[model samples]
Each structure stands twice: as C-alpha cells, then as structure tokens.
Target: ATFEIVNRCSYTVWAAASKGDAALDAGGRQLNSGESWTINVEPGTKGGKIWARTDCYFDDSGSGICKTGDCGGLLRCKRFGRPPTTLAEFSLNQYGKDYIDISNIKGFNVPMDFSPTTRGCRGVRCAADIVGQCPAKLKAPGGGCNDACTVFQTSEYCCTTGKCGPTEYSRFFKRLCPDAFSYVLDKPTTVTCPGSSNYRVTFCPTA
Candidate 1:
C-alpha cells in the first residue's frame, strides 16, 4: 500500500526514521513546510516507530522551554498500530506549556501549516528595528552591550565637533566579531542575553 508522511511545521524536518522490522534509518532529509512524500510499505506491519527531528534554537526570553509532549511547541511522535484500509489522519503537538501544534497528517491528503514561530529578543520591539535584538525587552538592568555603535567606538564617545575627541582613537576593528572577545574599556566585559525554545515531531507506520 502507499503511505504519505506530511510535515506540519514552520521549520523543515531535518530527518526521519521508522522503527519496525523493515524500518528505515535516520538521515539528513529536508522536508519543506506543508510538503509530503510517499513511501511504499507492505501490509501487516506492526510495532512501528517514527521519529522526526529539527535543529531548533533555544528561546532566550527566559519564558520557558519547548517540550515535545505537549501543545504550543512541537509534536514528538505518533504510532499507527495497523495500516488503514483507507486514508488516516494524525495530529502532532509540541512538547511544552506554550503548546504549539506542528502539523496534521491525513491519509492521501497533503496539508501544511505556514505559521512562523514567535521570535524572542533582549528588548521590547528591538527585534523589529535591530537585527540581533530580542522582541521582548530584557528584565535585568545591566546586561549585554549597549548597541553596535557603542561596541565600534574607540573612546566610547565622540567630541562636540561630531568627530573623534582627544580620548578617542580610530582603529580598524572587525565589523562582526565572533562569539569571543568579552572585553570593554580595556577591562573584561561581560553580558547576559535572553534565551529561546524549539520543538520537533515524528511519524511512522507499524503492523
């Protein structure tokens, strides 16, 4: 019989594995949003297992973690005891309190969810204006660098004439630094930023 695996998340499914006597192994296969692929399977397959995974980053807002066994996040896995005579439908949910549902699988029916994940940031509405800032404002008073301009300045401030002052000096600083270099004002600078959450789900057929 012909079976279909549907991807129901905003992100792509990195890999999928089936667990059964003739199960398939996990590998890198990108399933785009709302896309489905068909696989041939024999009848009377039992005890089947399926796993779908994603490379989701952590949520930096300190709100919570994304669990795979709950709603508002990502779905973990679902099992089908026997092959249906007709088509079947399966719904997957994320694994956390946020309870994000990824997608639903219907036999022979291809449906996709185009919903994007909520973005987290360091400051309120900062992600909209800036590139790397968080959508939600940070709670802590003193953390992280002030801005890109502050990090680029040599003397921390320009003179009244709108140019480098006596204390300021110009140097060819790298525009984008790696995640290293934690120094400021010749002193060891430190910063704490927000976090993020991600979810994933999987599906497989069994006897």
Candidate 2:
C-alpha cells in the first residue's frame, strides 16, 4: 500500500504522517507547490493519519514548532498533530475494506482531498477554509480552530452522553465541511472503500 502525498497549496507545507503511534516515511519532508511524495506504507500499517504542518520554522537539528499542526516540536511526529488540522485518516486492509475520513472533530485548519485510485471506492474531502471562518470562541490558544467540545467542554456540546445530535456549533462545521467528521455524534463521514488500497492526499488542493 502507498500514500501519495501531494502539496497543492501556494506555499510550502511540511507533511506529517504516522502509523499507529510512530512516524512513517521516517522524517517529515517539505513539499512545494505541485510536488508529491509517494510513500510505500507497510502492509501491516493500520489506522494511520496524514496531515500537513504550516508555517513551520525548524533549526538544523529539525527541532521547531509549526504555526499549525506541530507535533511535540518534532519534525517527524511521534504523536498526533495539534488541532485544528486537516486530517486524512485511514485503516488499511482492516477486515475487508479501507476506512477513510477527513476529521474536523478536533478542529480544522486546512483543506484536503482524499481519493482512491481504484474503482468501486468512493472518496471524501473537507476542502474548505474552516479555520479562517471559525467562530471566535472556538479559536485555539496558538493557531487553528477548535471544535465545539474544545471550547464549551459541556456534555451538551461534547456529546459525553455517548449520544448526540447537531448543535448550532456543530452545524457550523458540517455546513462548511459537509463531508468530514464534525463532532463525536457526527455519524462519521467515514467511508469504507472496498478493494482500493492506493490513495492520493492533496492539501489545499484548490487553494
């Protein structure tokens, strides 16, 4: 299996990816506009995430933080990136099909498109400038947007009861990113694309 990471944004973007809890493709790489990196992921890899770090500044030792999606100040993430971020999540070769989703449950910072190469598999994306239009209360301390739960911390908003419908806040995200997992009770826009393995992840594709 392989993930073809593409940078379609005007500016340079640092791509971060990991399988389980460890970084894949080894260290991160800077992807310029129209550039791409094809990473051959291990067949055993499952439940991995792909995201881009923006406005990053690193020293020669590759130690620095990004304006968005910094992972513990490391170039190669050993952990998940800070939200609100545009995430491409997938579970490869799990049971039968590959499960994929672009999540905004944590928040959203960029636009992304996740598509499969093979037939009979549907693709999904959150190609919108969500963070820029995020509500004032849900803004994070650093950069990027936060989900309703991150701001309110209430059962009503967080869906701690394990059951929830849409709120005025969650509706906001769903409206912009109509195809992403916008909240805990978001019904998960997760798509099970059977028989397709290879995928293309484009960041800020229309930007």
Candidate 3:
C-alpha cells in the first residue's frame, strides 16, 4: 500500500513513519511547505505509528531534538515519537478492514488528518485549534497539548491494566476534540477501510 505524506501547511515539517518490523523512515529529510513524501507500505502490518516533528533544529549529522514529536532525537525514527503530539495509528490487515485513526492519546502538536484515498471509506481527523487554546495544565512549553497520561501519569488516566474509568482531564480533551483518542479508554477514535485502500496523511489540512 502507498502511504502518501503531504505537508499542506505553509511551513517545514519533519514527517516520520514506522518502517514496519524495523523503525520509522520517511526519507529522514525535511519536507518544505507544500512538499510531500510517499513510501511503500506492506500489508498485514501491525503496531506502527506516524507523526510529524516541528520547530526542530538539527546539526549537519542529523542529530537534534524537535519541539514536538521528537523520536529519540534522531532524523530517522528508530522508535515511536514521544508524546505531546498527534499520531496516525495503523494496524493493517486486521479482522476485516485496515484500522486507522488520527490519535491524540499521546497529545496534540500539529493538526493532522488521516483518510483513505478511496471515496467509500469514512475519514477521521483532529484538525481543531489546539495550541494556545490548550489548557494550562495540559499545555506544553513550545507547542503541544500534553496527554492526560503524560501530564498526570496516574493509573486512573493511564489505565494501565487498572480499574480507573476516566478522569475530568480526559473529559476536557474529549470536549475539545471528541473524535480523537483522548485517553486510554478513548474508543470510537478509529476508522477502518478496505485492505487494498491507500491512505494520505495531511498536515494542517485546515490551516
């Protein structure tokens, strides 16, 4: 399958994606405004993610950290990006359709959207103005909306095999963007499409 990464926003964004059974590699380069990078994705994959790093400053050797979505401070993400950013979660070749979603469980950095290239499949996204408007308790220093789990780091919010249902912090996130994965218990944040269907992740689609 083809995973098209598009930067529609009028600024440079370091795009990152899982390399499948290895690590995340999307040319390991910066995409200028209106630029895009496409990669070949194999089917039957699972437990991988995609995100964008912004406000980054790297050396000539590609060693630096980003203000948001920094994956071990490397150009090529050998693992999942850190929290306080948006993510596109994917589990290809699932029970029936390929599961896909734009998740805010980690947090919200840049507004992003995930949708199938086909017309029949439904699209899911979190494109609201989260920065600046983010709650002080959940807001980050530079630009990000911290997840309840990241901010509080409690069992009730993290729900790490525990019995904590949900908290007011998660409720606040849900109120801002109900379609996103607000917390561990947040469901209905995923959408499925045909296995053969391709996808396109757009940064700042509504910007």
For 143-199, candidate 1 gives per-residue lDDT tens digits of: 211222333333343222444322211111112221111122322111121222221
TM-score ranking, best first? 3, 2, 1
Q: In candidate 2, what are the lDDT values of residues 1-207, reduced to their tens digit? A: 878999988989889997647888764778889899888777646778899888888888889989888888988776888776778998877777888888887788778999987776888988866777888888876777888787778887788989778888888889898899877877778888773488999888787
User: What lDDT does candidate 2 reach at residue 196?
Assistant: 40
Q: Report the C-alpha displacement of residue 161, candidate 3, in angstroms.
A: 2.4
Rank the candidate models, highest lDDT first: 2, 3, 1
Better of 2 and 3 by TM-score: 3
Global lDDT of model 1: 0.25
The models' CA-based lDDT, in order, is: 0.25, 0.82, 0.79
TM-score of model 2 (CA atoms): 0.91
Kindly give the number of clashing pairs for every candidate.
Answer: 34, 0, 1
Measured against the true structure, the TM-scores of the candidates, in listed sequence, are 0.26, 0.91, 0.92
Regions of model 3 farther than 4 Å from truth: 19-21, 25-27
